[PDB]
Design a protein around this ligand. Sequence first.
Ligand code: NA
Length: 248
Amino acid sequence: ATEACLPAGQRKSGMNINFYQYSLKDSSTYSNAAYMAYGYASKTKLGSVGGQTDISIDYNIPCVSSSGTFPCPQEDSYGNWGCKGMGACSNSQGIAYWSTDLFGFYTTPTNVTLEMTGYFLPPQTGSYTFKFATVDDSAILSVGGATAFNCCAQQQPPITSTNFTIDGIKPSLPPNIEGTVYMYAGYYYPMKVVYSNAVSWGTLPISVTLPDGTTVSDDFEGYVYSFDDDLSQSNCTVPDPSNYLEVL
Ligand code: NA
C-alpha cells in the first residue's frame, strides 16, 4: 500500500513551489536519480511560492522580431531560427531568459529546478494514473509518505527515495510517461514533482486519470493541498489506509 496521512492542522489550497539553481546548458546533472530525488536542494535556493493549483509547465522562450518580442511556441520554431508568423528571431536560443511564467516567480525558466509539494486528496477509492505528456527537460513524480515526503513534514528537507511514481529523468524518453497509484478516498497522499530545465523551452503537462475514467489536466484545484509542518502530530501517518482503524 501507498502510505497516506491525516494532517489535523489548517488545510491550504494548492502546492508549494521551491526553486533551486540549475546551470544553463548543463545536460548531465539532471540525468541522475539522486539529484532529482533530493540533490537539487543542495544547490542554492532561489525562492518559493505557495498555493499553486495549476501545475503544468509550458514555457516558451522569446522571439525578438521588429514587430516586438513574443513567446514562441516550441512547435512554431524553425530554421536558424524564426517563429511561424513572426519571421526571423534576433535573439539566441541558447542564453538564459527571465520570466514569471513559472508560478509567477521571477526567475530563469530556461535553467532552473523546481520542487512542487503538497498532498493529493482522492475523492474516490481506486486506481489513479498520473501522466506527463512530454518532459522538457527532466522530471519525476513521487506519491506516498515513504516516497514523496513524510506525513505532516511537507516543509522538511527532501527525503532520499528514488522509488518514483513517474520516472521522467532525461536519459530522450517517450511521450506519455505514466505511473499508477491505488488510493483510498479521503486520505491525504504526499505528492512531489521535481522538474528541471537546462535550456530554452520547458514543458511538463501533468494530468491524472481518476478511477471513474475521467481525466484532470493542469488545474488540480480541489485535489491538491498544503499543510504547515507539524512534527508533533503522533497519529498523522497512515501506512496502510485500507487497514486504518478509526473513522474518517
Ligand atoms: Na529545455
